[PDB]
C-alpha cells in the first residue's frame, strides 16, 4: 500500500529516499509485504511457498515484481536505471511507471530524464520518537539511529553514553 | 582543522574581469561543493553559484548573465571564481563556504571575503 | 525569503525573528550571524540544530511558511545582521533580506 511516516514496519525499520519512503528488514530478515518482515530460507521442499528473498516465493518473484539481477524489482523498473539512487512505482499517475527516487544528497534531473545526477536537498520526514534517537543520512539513506554522542548499549539495545 | 583561504582584494576597470580563488584544507575536496556569496556594503548575502568538485558540475544565477565562470582545480583543493563585464554593481566583497546535501550542514565554513572595487 | 530589516529587545529579554517562505516548512532552515567588517557563521542549521560552540541560547523552528530564530537573554555580544537561508529547486539557494538585532537597556 502507502509507506508513510507512520507505517509501522514489523519486524524491521523505515528508510527514506529523495521521494519515497520504505521498510528496511532488521538483521537478516526479509520482506513478506511492504510493511512486515519475516526470516528468510535456498528453497526445499518443506519451505514451500516461503519467503526466499525479497518480495519472492517459492525462488520467483511475487506478482508485479521480476528477478532482475538478482533481486526482485517491479516489473516497470524492468529497464530503468537511475545510478545514484532506485527505481520505483509511480504513485500519483494511476498506470504506475519506474521513476527514480535518489539518494540522499541527489535529486531528479530535469535535463536527464529525471534520472539522479542532481545535487539537491531531500528534508527528512522520519519521526525518531524512540529514547534519544533523531534522523541521521547514513550510507545515502535517512534512518533513525542514535542522536549526536550515542551509543546502542547492547545490553538493553538503547542509546546511552 | 579545516580552513576556506581566498585570494587579496583587487581593483579593476570597468568592463575587465576579476579571477577570485578559494583555497580548501582539512577536508576531502570532493565531499563538499563551494559556494560563491557576495555582498555589497548595503545589501545583505546574494548566491551567485556554487561548484560541485566531484561532478565538475556547475549551478549559477539567472542574474548574473553568463558572467560567473566557476572553475576548480582538485589538485590544489581550489575553486576559481571570474566575473567578466564588471560594472559598479560588482563592487562588493566575495565569499566562498562549502556545503552538504548529504549531510544537510549548510554554509557551516565561510572564506575571509575577497573585497574587489570596478573603479576608473 | 522575507525577514523583519529591524528587530529591537530589551537586554536579558527574548528576541524572535521570523523568516517567511513559500513552502517553508518543507526545507531545512539555516541562520547566520554576521558581525561588521568579518565574515558570517553559521549559528542554527536543519531548522533547529546549533553547530558546537554556539550558547544554547539560540533555538530555532521551522513549520508551515514561517521559520523562527530565538534567542534568549539577549546580550550585547548578539547586536548584529542574522540571515536566512534555504535551498529552493529553480533558484538554488536563497539568503533572506537580514535583520539588525538592537539590544535596547
Known amino acids: 500500500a502507502k509507506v508513510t511516516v507512520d507505517t509501522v514496519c514489523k519486524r524491521g525499520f523505515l528508510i527514506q529516499m529523495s521521494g519515497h519512503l520504505e521498510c528496511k528488514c532488521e538483521n537478516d530478515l526479509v520482506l513478506v509485504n511492504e510493511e512486515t518482515c519475516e526470516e528468510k530460507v535456498k528453497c526445499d521442499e518443506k519451505t514451500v511457498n516461503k519467503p526466499c528473498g525479497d518480495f519472492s516465493k517459492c525462488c520467483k518473484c511475487n506478482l508485479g515484481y521480476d528477478m532482475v539481477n538478482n533481486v526482485c524489482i517491479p516489473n516497470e523498473c524492468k529497464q530503468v536505471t537511475c545510478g545514484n539512487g532506485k527505481c520505483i512505482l509511480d504513485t500519483s499517475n494511476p498506470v504506475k511507471t519506474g521513476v527514480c527516487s535518489c539518494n540522499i544528497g541527489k535529486v531528479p534531473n530535469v535535463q536527464d530524464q529525471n534520472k539522479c545526477s542532481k545535487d539537491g536537498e531531500t528534508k527528512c520526514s522520519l519521526k525518531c520518537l524512540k529514547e534519544q534517537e533523531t534522523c541521521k543520512a547514513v550510507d545515502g539513506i535517512y534512518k533513525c539511529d542514535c542522536k549526536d554522542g550515542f551509543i546502542i548499549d547492547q545490553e538493553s539495545s538503547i542509546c546511552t553514553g | 582543522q579545516v580552513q576556506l583561504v581566498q585570494s587579496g582584494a583587487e581593483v579593476r576597470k570597468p568592463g575587465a574581469s576579476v579571477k577570485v580563488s578559494c583555497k580548501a584544507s582539512?577536508?576531502?575536496?570532493?565531499?563538499?561543493?563551494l559556494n560563491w556569496v557576495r555582498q555589497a556594503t548595503g545589501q545583505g548575502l546574494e548566491w551567485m553559484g556554487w561548484?560541485?568538485?566531484?561532478?565538475?558540475?556547475?549551478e549559477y544565477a539567472q542574474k548574473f548573465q553568463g558572467r560567473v565562470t566557476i572553475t576548480r582545480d582538485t589538485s590544489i583543493s581550489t575553486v576559481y571564481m571570474e566575473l567578466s563585464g564588471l560594472r559598479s554593481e560588482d563592487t562588493a566583497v566575495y565569499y566562498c563556504?562549502?556545503?552538504?546535501?548529504?549531510?544537510?550542514?549548510?554554509?557551516?565554513?565561510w572564506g575571509q571575503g575577497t573585497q574587489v572595487t570596478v573603479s576608473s | 525569503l522575507s525577514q523583519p530589516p529591524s528587530v529591537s529587545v530589551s537586554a536579558g529579554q527574548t528576541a524572535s525573528i521570523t523568516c517567511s517562505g513559500d513552502?517553508?516548512?518543507?526545507?531545512?532552515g539555516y541562520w547566520y550571524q554576521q558581525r561588521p567588517g568579518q565574515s558570517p557563521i553559521l549559528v542554527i542549521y536543519?531548522?533547529?540544530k546549533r553547530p558546537s560552540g554556539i550558547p544554547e541560547r539560540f533555538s530555532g523552528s521551522n513549520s508551515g511558511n514561517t521559520a523562527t530564530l530565538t534567542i534568549s537573554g539577549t546580550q550585547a555580544m548578539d547586536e548584529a545582521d542574522y540571515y536566512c537561508?534555504?535551498?529552493?529547486?529553480?533558484?538554488?539557494?536563497?539568503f533572506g533580506g537580514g535583520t539588525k538585532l538592537t539590544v535596547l537597556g
Open positions: 563556504a562549502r556545503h552538504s546535501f548529504k549531510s544537510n550542514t549548510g554554509f557551516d565554513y
Open positions: 582539512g577536508y576531502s575536496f570532493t565531499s563538499y561543493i
Open positions: 561548484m560541485n568538485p566531484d561532478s565538475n558540475n556547475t
Open positions: 513552502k517553508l516548512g518543507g526545507k531545512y
Open positions: 536543519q531548522d533547529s
Open positions: 537561508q534555504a535551498w529552493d529547486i529553480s533558484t538554488n539557494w536563497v
